[PDB]
Design a protein around this nucleic acid. Structure first.
Ligand code: ZN
Ligand code: ZN
Length: 431
RNA sequence: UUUUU
């Protein structure tokens, strides 16, 4: 049995790993590259898509399913297994990819063709290919997210996919993986733990209470797939102690995802399922408004607070959020709250450096608004959680992380008496 | 830590 990394090697985007065992070739994920590597989505896979027997997708995020349609575009016609939630979410993520894609590398037909081969596979259901046995494990990173357990030829492999931050409340706790001969694991936060969640929430509530009281605007850059909805959940469960204010989910995509959530009730934590059982959607706080078009979106830039605005891009790389920052950063009564990681080198990092004035949309703008960074909202297991999940595993191969981050985790794993390496692109690893 | 008017 062997596993060949074909993305997310010494980097975070591009997840796709070819499992060679049981007499078959199974591709684990097939995400796109994002950021500076984006052009690479136009380059070849490094393997023959027509020679793939099946595909399993851990979760709906673009860096795990973005290249799936290129796979079909290039001949693949086999099944693609994923949980119903991933299937449902993927549809939304793929349609959006088409629209907002600079230089596309697949077309609408490649997408309908890809979605056409999706077959449901839920946690605790074994898939059988030749002498290979595959199952999904609970990852707690997104609704329907999972890690993969592959057993064949007398050996056991586990592919973590992306693990969640078990401290948060929306998703259920990640399951522990089975004891394996090899674990291909992510290490996004290999260098450090996250600030405790409960502590992050209180600080979050304090910032909102303070800002909305003085009639200011609370600007929140958010990702449309789970982050935004998680914020609303907090607003619903604790907003009772906040001054009255409209909450604008200024993201059509986050809107579509929100609408889908009630259909995915069983994929959330017991806490969230219990709310739904009482007929109460915990993702819809009082004052929730979903902004569909540009006109109303821009109108918010000139309308006074108090208000809470949720918008993308979550990493400030374009989107309505920029327009809100352009017109709201100059007012000291407002507040910019980051609830997700900002890649060093980008606009977020600059803002956080607190310079006298940052440049947005081709223009310098004074930075008077207060700024906060709540990494505690992260959707990835922090180093400490990564260490707990990996506990007792003889061998670990690290992917999905910046080289330094992966090294930091590796150092600790090696010191713990566990064999570890940083996966290399195309370099098969025996299981 | 991944699309977005
Ligand atoms: Zn993810
Ligand atoms: Zn990922």
């Amino acid at each position: 049995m062997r596993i060949v990394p074909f993305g997310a090697a010494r980097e975070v985007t591009g997840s796709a790993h070819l499992l060679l065992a049981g007499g078959r070739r199974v591709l684990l994920d097939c995400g796109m590259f994002q950021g500076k590597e984006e052009a690479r989505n136009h380059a070849p896979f490094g393997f023959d898509p027509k020679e793939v027997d099946a595909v399993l997708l851990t979760h709906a995020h673009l860096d795990h399913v973005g290249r799936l349609p290129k796979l079909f575009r290039e001949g693949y016609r086999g099944p693609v297994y994923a949980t119903r939630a991933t299937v449902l979410l993927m549809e939304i993520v793929l349609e959006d990819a088409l629209k907002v894609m600079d230089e596309p590398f697949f077309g609408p037909e490649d997408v309908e063709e890809a979605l056409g081969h999706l077959r449901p596979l839920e946690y605790g259901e074994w898939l059988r290919l030749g002498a290979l046995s595959l199952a999904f494990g609970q990852a707690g990173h997104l609704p329907g997210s999972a890690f993969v357990v592959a057993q064949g030829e007398g050996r056991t492999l586990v592919y973590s996919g992306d693990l969640g931050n078990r401290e948060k409340d929306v998703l259920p706790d990640p399951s522990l993986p089975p004891l394996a001969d090899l674990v291909l694991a992510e290490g996004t936060y290999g260098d450090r733990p996250h600030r405790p969640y409960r502590e992050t929430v209180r600080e979050f509530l304090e910032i909102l209470e303070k800002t909305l009281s003085q009639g200011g605007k609370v600007l929140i850059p958010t990702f449309a797939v789970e982050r935004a909805q998680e914020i609303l959940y907090v607003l619903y469960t604790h907003g009772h102690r906040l001054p009255r204010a409209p909450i604008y989910l200024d993201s059509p995509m986050a809107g579509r995802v929100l609408s889908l959530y009630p259909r995915l009730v069983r994929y959330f934590s017991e806490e969230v399922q219990a709310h739904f059982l009482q007929g109460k959607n915990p993702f819809r706080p009082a004052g929730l408004e979903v902004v569909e078009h540009t006109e109303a979106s821009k109108a918010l830039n000139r309308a006074p607070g108090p208000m809470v605005v949720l918008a993308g891009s979550g990493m400030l790389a374009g989107g309505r959020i920029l327009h809100h920052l352009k017109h709201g950063l100059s007012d000291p009564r407002n507040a910019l709250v980051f609830v997700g990681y900002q890649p060093q080198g980008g606009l977020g990092a600059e803002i956080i450096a607190r310079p006298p004035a940052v440049r947005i949309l081709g223009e310098e703008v004074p930075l008077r608004a207060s700024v906060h960074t709540l990494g505690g909202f992260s959707g990835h297991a922090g180093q400490d959680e990564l260490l707990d999940w990996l506990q007792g595993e003889p061998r670990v191969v690290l992917v999905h992380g910046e080289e330094e981050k992966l090294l930091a985790l590796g150092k600790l794993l090696a010191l713990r008496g566990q064999e570890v390496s940083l996966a290399r692109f195309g370099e098969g690893v025996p299981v």
